[PDB]
Design a protein around this ligand. Structure first.
Ligand code: HEC
Length: 106
């Protein structure tokens, strides 16, 4: 269900596997981030991003200047609408990880 949420309030700056190599577009690749970044921070950042950057909470201040020097605004989503989108990033990562010694596209 989180895939429909991605397509309607998220795909404007993102993908789940499909940035350009070492070139993060308007916003970096979400596939596998659920198993790299802190699992509380990932969901909380999505609920208050431009105001976490205004708190000067330094985890964000470090990461944003190293992708594309652009800020993410708050989309103003609801908690259960976020929970479904967390389950899209988690379950699409669980299927589209493609560790078959062939993830590339010819
Ligand atoms: C363009 C205005 C954006 C929209 C809309 C969304 N995101 Fe984003 N994202 C954007 C940038 C510039 C960056 C870097 C700063 C930051 O927001 O962290 C990102 C990054 C992420 C990350 C963190 C990646 C990491 O290295 O850990 C996540 C997990 C993320 N964004 C999630 C996310 C979701 C779920 C959104 C749709 C509802 C969303 N973003 C919208 C820019 C933009």
């Amino acid at each position: 269900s989180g895939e429909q949420i991605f397509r309607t309030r998220c795909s404007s700056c993102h993908t789940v596997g499909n940035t350009e190599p070492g070139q993060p577009g308007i916003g970096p690749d979400l596939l596998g981030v659920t198993r790299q970044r802190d699992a509380n921070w990932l969901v909380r950042w999505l609920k208050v991003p431009d105001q976490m950057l205004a708190e000067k909470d330094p985890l964000a201040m470090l990461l944003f200047e190293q992708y594309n020097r652009l800020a993410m605004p708050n989309m103003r989503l609801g908690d259960a609408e976020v929970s479904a989108l967390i389950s899209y990033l988690e379950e699409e990562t669980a299927r589209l990880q493609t560790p078959v010694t062939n993830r590339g596209i010819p």
